[PDB]
């Protein structure tokens, strides 16, 4: 609708969902999808297939905006990360590159109990 051509694809993988966001060359989102955006409602969202689908939903909706080439950026380490990547590559969009940018503190905040017991 605005014609952007080339941009960024952000994969936010986690153990509960995969949410993809495509943005213009400088971070502003164009479209987005996720296990919830598509059918899946609960546990299924995490699954890699859902990731695959969301990834495709994202690209498809992005090509409408005239997208063609993307720069992928992966954040997260969920059960479905690597699938969204293979999804975008076969989506039609050209994967110019892949980069893992998962945030990691240099030891800041006391984690939730669920994420402790970690020496």
């Amino acid at each position: 609708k605005r014609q952007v051509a080339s941009g960024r694809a952000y994969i936010h993988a986690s153990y509960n969902n995969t949410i993809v966001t495509i943005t213009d060359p400088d971070g502003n989102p164009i479209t987005w999808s996720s296990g919830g955006v598509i059918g899946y409602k609960g546990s299924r969202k995490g699954t890699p297939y859902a990731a695959q689908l969301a990834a495709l939903d994202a690209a498809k909706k992005a090509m409408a905006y005239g997208m063609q080439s993307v720069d992928v950026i992966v954040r997260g380490t969920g059960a479905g990360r690597e699938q969204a990547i293979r999804a975008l590559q076969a989506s039609g969009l050209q994967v110019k590159s892949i980069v893992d940018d998962t945030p990691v503190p240099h030891n800041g905040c006391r984690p939730k109990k669920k994420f402790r017991k970690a020496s």
Partner: protein, 73 residues
């Protein structure tokens, strides 16, 4: 395995306390801002301990990075 070559053998006579020689210091950081382990640096307990001090100093100055993005996956 850890056998690509040790960064020490790959260098020449250099001052481990020179926190400005980013030219060489940089060769001690991984494909990320991360300080390489002795298995890779080829340095010694004492040498390695001084490097750290130096690197961190360069990082504060802006000459060296604290972290970088992995390019693949």
């Amino acid at each position: 395995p850890s056998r690509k070559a040790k960064v020490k053998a790959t260098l020449g006579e250099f001052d481990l306390r020179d926190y400005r020689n980013v030219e060489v210091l940089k060769r001690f950081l991984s494909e990320t801002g991360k300080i390489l382990p002795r298995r890779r640096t080829g340095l010694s307990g004492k040498e390695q301990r001084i490097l750290a001090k130096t690197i961190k100093r360069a990082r504060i100055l802006g000459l060296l990075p604290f972290t970088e993005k992995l390019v693949r996956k």
